[PDB]
Symmetry: D2
């Protein structure tokens, strides 16, 4: 609990609605204002999805350019991590430091989140061509082994690789403390040099965050994963969620990573 802590703010996401969370940033201007407030509260990475003005998900290259440029203008030290979810490669030309790589398929609510093995390989190879570092999203134990297989084949070559555990999806592994303890130990056995962060969906935000705090892990928070500050109490901003984690880190004496330290830990240099 003395190693620097990297806080990631996943500010918008692809599913969260304004009806449920009226403070959801949707426009590039709103996303830049939120990114600055999050950075000041202690966040060093923004996990970015884009939306159209009506709030529907967007994949428009010009919209990604508008959002990335707006955020970099107000917080140039921020690390931008985009989710682009063969014309889905176009935003990588905007030089994000990182991009999401989903490590597998899972049932996801009353639906299926499909990431075909051939498409995982194709995306991993495209990130290398564009010099973009992967942010590898893992929802289950078997996805760690699948990533280790891609490392052995020389497809995923980033080292130290960064794993983003996403716990609490209906269909995926839950965020109960037993699960996060198992996952970090399993990852240490299978990919010894990998670093990791955890995202705890909804009610799992508090247990995942406090375990990561004292086990050397990093933490992702934000409206993409959780809109509540307390049970039944809507959060006022993503920065409010980041600031609570920063206050707990200050209480226990765990320093927040500087932008330089975050780039070193995540091997972005």
């Amino acid at each position: 609990h003395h190693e620097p802590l990297i806080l990631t703010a996943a500010i918008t996401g692809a599913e969260t609605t304004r009806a449920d969370q009226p403070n959801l940033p949707i426009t590039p201007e709103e996303q830049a204002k939120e990114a600055k407030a999050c950075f000041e509260a202690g966040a060093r990475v923004i996990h970015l999805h884009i939306r159209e003005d009506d709030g529907r998900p967007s994949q428009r290259l010009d919209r990604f350019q508008e959002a990335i440029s707006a955020i970099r203008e107000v917080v140039p030290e921020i690390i931008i991590q985009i989710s682009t979810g063969d014309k889905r490669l176009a935003p990588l030309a905007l030089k994000p430091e990182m991009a999401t790589l989903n490590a597998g398929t899972l049932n996801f609510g009353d639906d299926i989140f499909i990431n075909h093995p051939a498409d995982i390989i194709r995306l991993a190879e495209a990130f290398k061509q564009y010099n973009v570092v992967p942010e590898v999203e893992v929802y289950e134990s078997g996805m760690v082994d699948a990533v280790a297989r891609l490392i052995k084949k020389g497809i995923i070559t980033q080292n130290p690789l960064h794993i983003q555990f996403v716990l609490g999806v209906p269909g995926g592994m839950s965020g109960k403390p037993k699960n996060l303890m198992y996952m970090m130990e399993h990852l240490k056995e299978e990919i010894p040099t990998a670093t990791w962060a955890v995202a705890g969906i909804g009610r799992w935000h508090i247990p995942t965050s406090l375990i990561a705090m004292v086990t050397g892990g990093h933490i992702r928070c934000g409206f993409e994963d959780n809109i509540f500050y307390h049970k039944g109490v809507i959060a006022e901003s993503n920065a409010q969620l980041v600031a609570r984690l920063a206050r707990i880190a200050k209480e226990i004496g765990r320093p927040l990573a500087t932008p330089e330290q975050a780039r070193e830990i995540l091997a972005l240099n």
Copy 2:
């Protein structure tokens, strides 16, 4: 967890993927499957986990083919529990997955989720899992719930809470070692049985260890009260680089280890009681 509780051995003799090119002893016809089932029962198996194939070796879902295989096995070994799996390969029918449940087998496979599976995807949409679970209740067939990942245990617990899976005690078949799924390393099987105990306290469980995971999963299950599945569906090797000569050879080794450590093999009556088939 006690190595004195009866042990149920399941023989998964054919499967949907194993080829004769890799395993020439693979039983594919109802006659071959019946001969293998008798040899497996004599070696200690109490359940046959059955997939059917056409004579050219391709996966089958034909009702008449399931009837031929079930009748052939029951004729030679009426005491064995027949557990059928009703999915097919690319070009399968979804409706044909339900039709063999009408044959009221003692058990049938219920998949608990989707996963990448080798170079492909093994798809089990949440609405289709529910539809199949409802067909099990309609035909009074006991499910054998196949779990490949931690999240599938939570998904099954949700289906119990929703009154979709009403079977109690419920039997979970962990399938470990699939490329894309959870591996069969000892840490994983220990985690899975503990996780299952937390989420579905009355559930029983068995483990299948694909390929090289057959030995670590079997020996851990032996001393933790779990049950064991073996066979050519999951593993074709007796030792590394030594192909198994029959499914009964794999069953017999587990029976010998159980006899060495003093863990009794379940009688057919005990297996039906444990699995709540009466």
Copy 3:
């Protein structure tokens, strides 16, 4: 679950901590009462109490226990007093039982022996049984101190034999002693799971000695466990920064619980959870 009430215990003095290392250490009944009131106001619901003579040496004097218990109850009548009746080299075994006649709400019961720094902390199996039987005689609820996995099994065996009959039983894990199990997250996760397997209805708290205070506290926060803090176990607020009071340590835990939305137990809730009624 991080929504269940949290019981904070302040172990304010202990048998080993010195004033040379921690000048804010309360040693007299008056000092212990002032600290107990400040800890209660900061969120503590239990005081884990050792007594000392005015020269700072450990005490077992019945009159000294009466002076400390009365002083604390006078200023904070709602707090739960949990006494520890052992002494240092030259202690009396019979004096370990004598304060149970003062009918404290709770008292420490040691579950085993271990090497403890350069010495040995001895608790012979027959003496553990004798003390457990004395708890029943005086209607005192035990606070069972466990330092190793084998001590959980030893307690489960005493329950099976009808020697420890308190149900729900409260286990105090003490992690981080040199000679005992450390407070690393893997260990606390193992211990709560091991306890759930062996004594399913038991409740638990954790004390993390020295550097283990932070990892044990934050894991207990989100696993439904209770937390012990204080100068008996840890004298530092941060690495190389001594704590100014026991209440300073309690208040940090109370602030973290407020941040995450875990309510602090009321005195009534603490007595219900610990089955003191």
Copy 4:
């Protein structure tokens, strides 16, 4: 993994087991030598040795240790002798055993206490270095692993790779349930990464500890010191009968037994 060589240790006599409970208990040097050779032929590569007087009471007599060690070496010179010495307890180390027991801590042990004072652990560890005897470090609890790691850091225990003997199932110590052995091997890997380990499962814990060690790369100790039963309520006929079952299970699963040369290499006895 279950392909790494397996070292089987036979703890043939112990300090507590009685002839009343186990009539096949070897007590004399001649009986111990015959049992050691039968165990070696069944697959054992180490003998964990305690000595007794002819009436069966425990012994610490130097001449009795010399008689037992010489008798075993005469009939099975390839076996590794590991003695338990129980401050003139150092005298038998001059008989050049390859290994000797180092108890890593104190614990309640049945209706008694097994005392190993921190200063005495250090004194014994230093003596083993003086006599060039490799320690067999007996661990009964999680905290004993940390205590050993502290002695390594202090330069008191210098053997590397160090061999840890987990002793599970003592009333007062950690039990032999699978959750515990999995925790212990992982805990040891974190705290002493290069250490090797074996497990002894007292009484009913012999089977769960042995089968977990089989498939996790661990080594196994068996024998009348720890367990006298072949099955529940069925007294074993010999220590070699217990060793032979483990050798048969290893053969079934394809785990090779260590040769004497491999056992000396793994245990760093050269």
